[PDB]
């Protein structure tokens, strides 16, 4: 309870909760209110949003990212997953 803070990508479970809470804290909501299966283009990630939170995500992971991953995994249940394969 009272979750709100990043962790470290130690399995896809972690990358999920990170994405989720960083969605919560963008949107002013609970993390558990985030649709990890709905496309981010329907949430507040309008377009350039992707780059803010990408430039968090890649840095959180210690690396770079690519814009294609917006355009290929636009959901937590795909992004967190695929990050757990590109990285973890």
* Residue 9 contacts residue 82 (beta carbons within 8 Å): no
Domain ranges of the chain: 1-88
Cα–Cα dist 1/82, whole Å? 27
* Residue 75 contacts residue 45 (beta carbons within 8 Å): no
Distances (CA, A) of 23 to 8, 45, 85: 16, 9, 21
* Residue 65 contacts residue 39 (beta carbons within 8 Å): no
Homologous superfamily of domain range 1-88: ACP-like (1.10.1200.10)
Among residues 13, 8, 6, the alpha carbon closest in space to that of 80 is found at 13
Distances (CA, A) of 61 to 28, 45, 50, 84: 24, 20, 16, 10
Method: NMR
């Amino acid at each position: 309870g009272s979750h709100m803070k990043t962790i470290q990508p130690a399995s896809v479970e972690d990358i999920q909760s990170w994405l989720i809470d960083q969605f919560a804290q963008q949107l002013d909501v609970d993390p558990d209110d985030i649709d990890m299966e709905e496309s981010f283009d329907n949430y507040d990630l309008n377009s350039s949003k992707a780059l803010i939170l990408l430039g968090r995500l890649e840095k959180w992971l210690g690396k770079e990212l690519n814009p294609v991953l917006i355009f290929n995994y636009p959901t937590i249940a795909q992004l967190a997953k695929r990050l757990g394969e590109l990285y973890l």
